[PDB]
């Protein structure tokens, strides 16, 4: 019972939502591809560039490279805290060119990290994703000259560390110079080296006006290419003597060497596509038969002269235009740092040749795994494009894999981020979400791929459109880049159609991102859907058209922060993407084929498929996510149920029957409430807690090491010296806590003892033990206890002992013990609630069901929301959702209202009317008229003009109900609220609660070593940061002693904090420090620099701030 709105029916589904991660890393590894037929891209092109090297003859070559098999599964890689990787080998043969010797063998080069099915990696047991990067695409560009208002300059740019930037500028003199590596020189000097004469340079280039006359230098056009090459070498490299063998070697490596200059394969397409020529190879110049042969300089000089002349068909390139920016996906980012570790293995080969026995050296002892291993490990563990996977819920992980970052190595920095790149470019339409982006310093830097957006082979983002020929739409879709998009006139997706033919005489369309009304004969493409413009999360916001984009940004971000719930529901009003999100997130479980279910329990689902196979599917139960949220799958099929392929078998976290279930559907009332909902605060009913709504399961891991101390080995044991039998009840035989015990802060989880480091017990300690007849143990309790504010019941245990099979551990560590604790967290005051429209709020008051505002039939609301959080934030979509939820509440139905193609206001009022007949009709059938309190409300609603005068009480109630409003009684008084009050169902999520966001409180704890400032510990929290702006505030108040306590006694003053603690302990007022410790350290650090620092008093006499301590 779920109605779908909308006139637009998408002709194609969303792409494989993780194909930006999966297909990239697959294309780079080419695992299932035979090494004979591999396409010379990615991880093999790194070898075919590094090899073959030769420099006493040596020729190591590249034949095959093969992936190994994972030594460990993904689960035991997460359990062991080891990177999920396979060994990488390669067939390297050594050729002695002077002898003819050949020596083949296969050598270990390094461990290659492998990608999972969903599209992430496991590094040191941690799930980890590699975000895509946006950067400037290579090729040739033409921009207007800043310091010359008349002309434009050209720029040839290749891949980074793959050639230098090249500029072509026309000076005020009129001669055309060329800028390379902070050098300037005329173009003909290089053109002479390229084999051009003045006779050829004129005829094909004469038509652009007087521009050739700025290129002609008769003195340079007179010399041979041989002496022009050396004339070039002297200008840009004026260090060494200009020998002609070095001048040739330089220009060859600079512009002609394919391994030292490789303008991108995408940049070569860009150069070929922009200039209208044809380029074989990725260099600017070749080197055939001994002379240089041009490839790019003549076409790009023609385009520059053409553009400066004003010929049509030539334009300036937009810097942000998404045809001039590209995407570095996972495989490209890895294979780039791969060849870096090969260029460092190259040195590890080159230098190993001058030594040893240069006649016979195996490439086994010529090549080491250390260079490449350390290169890939730096990438997956340190690169800012590789960060902790966000798996708060299935939607979180799907979104994280689709992020596009301008930051990272080779990318931008936040200080030099500026605004140009932070902005929304007109080409983002259909490729980059214009609303989903962080709030804070990373605005516009980190974005999200659009729903229908795909990244092509060259790294450019495309979006589908429907081809239309003569006002008739075709089933043919075409993915076009931003450059190809500017070529056509493209109509909006919501243009009225008479069954696949256009209806209106005025079509809304776009030309280079410009709103233009058009006739059905001028349209050649049409948008596929409104969904293609926004990201996944933004497409999950119903009535998005009625939400201002700023709060809709928050609505997109917070769905990523929603914790999975025990009784998680799909929203009452949906957008139609909720099923596909859980499908592509790989958090649920589906049937591999047609078949029948034969076994169903909480741990496994067994089905017999067509092909006769019997497959049992293990259900992951209460597993810990990176953020501590419970990953839990639950069966959704019965025994004997016959399922089709792709049919749901088990729901993952935050999924209800296969639909994204990020929260709960709660009955909301929009009204103030005694200030408990002041400034975004939220009032909730206790009934939510009774029904376990918004209850989540969170699992935290704890860990303790038993180490080898020079004072003696630490021991995991139940024998803890001075401890009660009660404090050890839940400790098993070997000292670690039992599964199923409830642990509260301070309780022991793993018992441990450490040797004291033999010292005399103090005489007071000796007399103390003599009184109580206790003989001192030689060991102290160092057992792992549960930190404050944390707890739950133990659900997992794990022990890794050195000297036992399968496990190797850190040096000096005898064994490690891990304990897993789970807790059920029900909604409480302080928890953060939110809807998909950007409404935020902290639960401020949990109220008894009796105090809650309720309907005449006794039904109480679940949550009270303040209307004051709406007008200045301009998100009327939450109001439309509440109105639609009111209808579906009494109608007992859910709704699908797509973005920009959802439920109209009249369609909603009709449902509201049909719902009133049910609700009010059932009330008459039970024999109850219109209450006298309701008639009291109906009287005022007429005074202000909310109901029409003259109609009956039932009719006025109906006029309120289709306005979305109802009469509501105050559970505290029985009296009604004086005005009608819009109630309904709203989808509300509970947002994630980071560890540092919980309640902290310190009195006294550890202090740092060098600076004596408060430091967090296992038993105590750290102190709050009292920064300089707070110093100014206390100064502004003139509260000197308050500021003096912060800067001394409460922080780094050793004597002061000890004296103050004792003062409070003995009921004494805390004293002031006679001379603070920061003063003392400053003087001694200055005296260390041989500077006499004199501390003088009122009459200039020396004060000794060291009282008999350092005075001699």
**Residue 169: helix, strand or coil by DSSP?**
strand
Q: Least distance (Å) from another protein to the CB of residue 874?
A: 6
Q: Least distance (Å) from another protein to the CB of residue 744?
A: 6
Q: Least distance (Å) from another protein to the CB of residue 367?
A: 24
Q: How far apart are CA 668 and CA 870, in angstroms?
A: 14
Q: Least distance (Å) from another protein to the CB of residue 621?
A: 29
Q: Which element (helix H / strand E) includes 455?
A: strand 454-455
- Which CB, 260 or 825, lies closer to another protein? 825
- Which CB, 973 or 1094, lies closer to another protein? 1094
Q: Where are the alpha helices (DSSP H) in 81-147?
A: none
Written as six digits, the tokens of 330 are 């996972």
Q: Least distance (Å) from another protein to the CB of residue 788?
A: 8
**Residue 897: helix, strand or coil by DSSP?**
coil
- Which CB, 939 or 1033, lies closer to another protein? 1033
Written as six digits, the tokens of 616 are 């049992």
Q: Which of 402, 444, 450, 453 is nearest to 423 (CA)?
A: 444
- Which CB, 928 or 1037, lies closer to another protein? 1037
Angle at the Cα of 890 (from 884 to 893), degrees rounded to 5?
65
**Residue 1098: helix, strand or coil by DSSP?**
coil
Q: What DSSP designation does 255 have? A: I
- Which CB, 331 or 971, lies closer to another protein? 971
For residue 282, CA distances in Å to 157, 255, 268, 334 come to: 12, 10, 6, 22
CA 296 to chain centre: 39
CA 984 to chain centre: 34
- Which CB, 344 or 1000, lies closer to another protein? 1000
Q: CB neighbours of 704 closer than 8 A, spacing ≥ 6?
A: 716, 749, 750, 752, 783, 784, 816, 817
> CA dihedral defined by 42, 45, 50, 53, rounded to 10 degrees?
160
> CA dihedral defined by 834, 836, 837, 838, rounded to 10 degrees?
40
Q: Least distance (Å) from another protein to the CB of residue 964?
A: 5
**Residue 769: helix, strand or coil by DSSP?**
helix
Q: Least distance (Å) from another protein to the CB of residue 775?
A: 13
The three-state (H, E, C) secondary structure of 447-495, written as one string: EEECCCCEECCCCCEEEEEEEECCCEEEEEEEEECHHHHCCCEEECCCC
- Which CB, 97 or 943, lies closer to another protein? 943
Q: Least distance (Å) from another protein to the CB of residue 692?
A: 19
Q: How far apart are CA 295 and CA 1106, in angstroms?
A: 79
Phi, psi (deg, nearest 5) at residue 364: -70, -45
Q: Least distance (Å) from another protein to the CB of residue 651?
A: 29
Q: How many CA atoms lie within 13 A of 369 on its CB side?
A: 13
Q: How far apart are CA 421 and CA 319, in angstroms?
A: 9
Q: How far apart are CA 961 and CA 949, in angstroms?
A: 16
829-844 per-residue burial string, b: 16 or more CB within 10 A, e: under 16: eebbbbbbbbbbbebb
For residue 946, CA distances in Å to 854, 940, 964 come to: 21, 8, 12
Q: Which of 479, 487, 475 is nearest to 524 (CA)?
A: 487
- Which CB, 173 or 724, lies closer to another protein? 724
- Which CB, 147 or 441, lies closer to another protein? 441
- Which CB, 78 or 836, lies closer to another protein? 836
- Which CB, 84 or 1021, lies closer to another protein? 1021
- Which CB, 64 or 545, lies closer to another protein? 545
Q: How many CA atoms lie within 13 A of 411 on its CB side?
A: 25
Q: Least distance (Å) from another protein to the CB of residue 356?
A: 26
Q: How far apart are CA 178 and CA 184, in angstroms?
A: 5
Q: Least distance (Å) from another protein to the CB of residue 1073?
A: 8
Q: Least distance (Å) from another protein to the CB of residue 1107?
A: 10
Q: Least distance (Å) from another protein to the CB of residue 126?
A: 18
Q: Which element (helix H / strand E) includes 798?
A: strand 792-801
Q: Least distance (Å) from another protein to the CB of residue 544?
A: 8
Q: Least distance (Å) from another protein to the CB of residue 575?
A: 14
Q: How far apart are CA 192 and CA 226, in angstroms?
A: 9
Q: Least distance (Å) from another protein to the CB of residue 816?
A: 13
For residue 273, CA distances in Å to 140, 881, 1087 come to: 10, 49, 70
Q: How far apart are CA 649 and CA 638, in angstroms?
A: 9
Contact between 862 and 843 under an 8 Å Cβ cutoff? The reply is no
- Which CB, 198 or 550, lies closer to another protein? 550
Placement of tokens 């999966």 in the chain = 22
Reported in sequence order, the residue ranges of 401-440 that DSSP labels E, i.e. its strands, are 403-405
**Residue 337: helix, strand or coil by DSSP?**
helix
Placement of tokens 């009133």 in the chain = 916
- Which CB, 364 or 711, lies closer to another protein? 711
Q: Least distance (Å) from another protein to the CB of residue 845?
A: 8
Q: Least distance (Å) from another protein to the CB of residue 926?
A: 28
Contact between 976 and 937 under an 8 Å Cβ cutoff? The reply is yes
- Which CB, 193 or 533, lies closer to another protein? 533
- Which CB, 751 or 964, lies closer to another protein? 964
- Which CB, 102 or 868, lies closer to another protein? 868
- Which CB, 309 or 809, lies closer to another protein? 809
Q: How many CA atoms lie within 13 A of 322 on its CB side?
A: 31
Q: CB neighbours of 1027 closer than 8 A, spacing ≥ 6?
A: none
């Amino acid at each position: 019972e779920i109605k779908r709105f909308g006139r637009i029916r998408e002709v194609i589904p969303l792409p494989p939502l993780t194909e930006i991660q999966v297909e990239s890393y697959k294309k780079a590894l080419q695992a299932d591809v035979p090494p004979e037929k591999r396409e010379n891209v990615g991880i093999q092109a790194a070898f075919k560039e590094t090899f073959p090297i030769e420099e006493g003859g040596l020729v190591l070559d590249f034949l095959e490279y093969r992936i190994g098999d994972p030594p460990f599964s993904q689960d035991e890689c997460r359990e062991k805290d080891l990177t999920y990787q396979a060994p990488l080998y390669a067939r390297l043969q050594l050729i002695h060119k002077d002898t003819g010797l050949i020596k083949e063998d296969e050598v270990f080069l390094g461990h290659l990290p492998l990608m999972t099915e969903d599209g992430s990696f496991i590094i040191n047991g941690a799930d980890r994703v590699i975000v895509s990067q946006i950067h400037r695409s290579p090729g040739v560009y033409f921009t207007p000259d800043p310091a010359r208002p008349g002309r434009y300059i050209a720029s040839i740019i290749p891949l980074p560390k793959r050639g230098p930037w090249i500029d072509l500028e026309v000076e005020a003199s009129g001669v055309v110079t060329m800028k390379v590596n902070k050098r300037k020189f005329p173009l003909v000097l290089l053109l002479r080296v390229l084999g051009y004469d003045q006779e050829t340079l004129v005829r094909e280039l004469s038509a652009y006006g007087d521009l050739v006359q700025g290129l002609l230098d008769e003195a340079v056009l007179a010399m041979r290419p041989e002496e022009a090459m050396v004339r070039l070498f002297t200008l840009l490299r004026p260090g060494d003597p200009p020998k002609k063998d070095k001048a040739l070697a330089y220009l060859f490596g600079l512009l002609a060497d394919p391994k030292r200059y490789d303008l991108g394969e995408a940049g070569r397409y860009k150069a070929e596509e922009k200039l209208g020529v044809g380029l074989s190879g990725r260099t600017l110049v070749r080197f055939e038969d001994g002379e240089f042969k041009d490839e790019v300089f003549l076409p790009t000089l023609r385009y520059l002269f053409a553009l400066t002349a004003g010929v049509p068909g030539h334009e300036v390139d937009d810097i942000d235009h998404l045809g001039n920016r590209r995407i570095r996906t996972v495989g490209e980012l890895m294979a780039d740092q791969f060849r870096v570790g090969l260029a460092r293995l190259a040195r590890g080969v080159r230098e190993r040749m001058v030594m040893g026995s240069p006649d016979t050296l195996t490439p086994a002892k010529l090549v080491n795994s250390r260079p490449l291993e350390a290169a890939l490990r730096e990438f997956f563990s340190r690169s800012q494009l590789s960060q902790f996977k966000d798996e708060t819920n299935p939607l979180s992980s799907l979104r994280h894999k689709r992020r596009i970052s301008a930051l990272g190595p080779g990318g931008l920095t936040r200080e030099r981020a500026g605004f140009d790149v932070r902005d929304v470019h007109r080409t983002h339409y259909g490729r980059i979400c214009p609303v989903e982006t962080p709030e804070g310093a990373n605005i516009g830097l980190i974005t999200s791929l659009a729903a229908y957006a795909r990244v092509d082979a060259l790294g450019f983002i495309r979006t589908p459109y429907r081809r239309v020929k003569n006002g008739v739409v075709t089933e043919e879709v075409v993915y076009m880049t931003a450059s190809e998009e500017d070529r056509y006139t493209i109509a909006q997706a919501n243009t009225p159609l008479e069954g696949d033919r256009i209806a209106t005489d005025r079509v809304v369309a776009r030309r280079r991102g410009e709103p233009v009304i058009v006739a059905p004969e001028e349209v050649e493409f049409m948008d596929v859907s409104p969904k293609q413009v926004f990201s996944l999360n933004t497409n999950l916001i119903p009535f998005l058209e009625h939400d201002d984009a700023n709060r809709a940004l928050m609505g997109s971000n917070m769905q990523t922060q929603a914790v999975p719930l025990i009784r998680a529901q799909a929203p009452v009003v949906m957008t139609g993407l909720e099923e596909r999100v859980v499908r592509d997130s790989l958090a649920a479980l589906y049937a591999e084929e047609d078949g029948e279910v034969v076994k169903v329990d909480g741990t496994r689902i067994a089905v017999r498929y067509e092909d006769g196979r019997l497959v049992e599917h293990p259900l992951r139960r209460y597993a810990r996510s990176n953020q501590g949220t419970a990953f839990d799958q639950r069966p959704r099929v019965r025994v004997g149920q016959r399922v089709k392929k792709g049919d749901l078998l088990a729901d993952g976290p935050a999924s209800e029957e296969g639909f994204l279930a990020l929260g709960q559907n709660v009955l909301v009332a929009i009204m103030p409430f005694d200030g408990y909902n002041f400034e975004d605060a939220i009032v909730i009913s206790e009934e939510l807690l009774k029904r376990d709504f918004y209850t989540s399961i969170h699992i935290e891991r704890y860990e303790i090491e038993a180490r080898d101390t020079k004072l003696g080995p630490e021991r995991i044991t139940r024998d803890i010296p001075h401890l009660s039998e009660a404090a050890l009840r839940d400790l098993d035989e070997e000292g670690i806590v039992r599964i199923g015990a409830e642990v509260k802060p301070g309780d022991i989880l793993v018992g441990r003892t450490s040797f004291k480091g033999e010292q005399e017990p103090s005489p007071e300690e000796r007399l103390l033990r003599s009184i109580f007849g206790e003989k001192a143990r030689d060991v102290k309790d160092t057992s792992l206890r549960v930190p404050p504010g944390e707890g739950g019941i133990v659900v997992g245990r794990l022990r890794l002992r050195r000297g036992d099979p399968g496990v190797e551990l850190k040096p000096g560590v005898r064994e490690v013990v891990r304990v897993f604790v789970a807790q059920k967290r029900k909604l409480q005051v302080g928890d953060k609630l939110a809807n998909r429209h950007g409404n935020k709020g902290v639960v401020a008051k949990i109220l008894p069901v009796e105090d809650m505002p309720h309907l005449p039939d006794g039904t109480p609301v679940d949550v009270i929301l303040n209307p004051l959080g709406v007008p200045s934030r301009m998100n009327l979509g939450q109001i439309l959702e509440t109105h639609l939820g009111l209808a579906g509440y009494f109608l007992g139905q859910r709704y699908i209202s797509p973005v920009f193609d959802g439920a109209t206001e009249p369609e909603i009022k009709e449902l509201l009317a049909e719902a009133f007949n049910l609700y009010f009709g059932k009330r008459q059938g039970e024999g109850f008229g219109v209450d006298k309190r309701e008639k009291e409300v109906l009287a005022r609603a007429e005074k202000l003009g909310l109901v029409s005068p003259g109609k009956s009480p039932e009719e006025q109630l109906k006029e309120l109900f289709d306005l979305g409003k109802v009469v509501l009684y105050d559970g505290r008084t029985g009296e009604p609220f004086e005005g009608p009050i819009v109630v309904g169902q709203m989808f509300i999520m509970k947002l994630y609660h980071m560890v540092e966001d919980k309640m902290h409180a310190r009195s006294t704890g550890p202090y740092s070593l060098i600076t004596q400032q408060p430091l967090g510990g296992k038993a105590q929290f750290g102190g709050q940061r009292f920064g300089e702006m707070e110093v100014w505030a206390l100064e502004a108040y003139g509260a000197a002693h308050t500021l003096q306590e912060m800067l001394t006694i409460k922080s780094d003053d050793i004597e002061g904090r000890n004296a103050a603690y004792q003062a409070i302990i003995k009921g004494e007022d805390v004293p002031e420090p006679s001379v603070p410790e920061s003063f003392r350290v400053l003087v001694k650090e200055l005296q260390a620099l041989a500077l006499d620092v004199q501390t003088l008093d009122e009459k200039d006499n020396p004060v000794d701030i060291f009282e008999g301590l350092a005075s001699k």
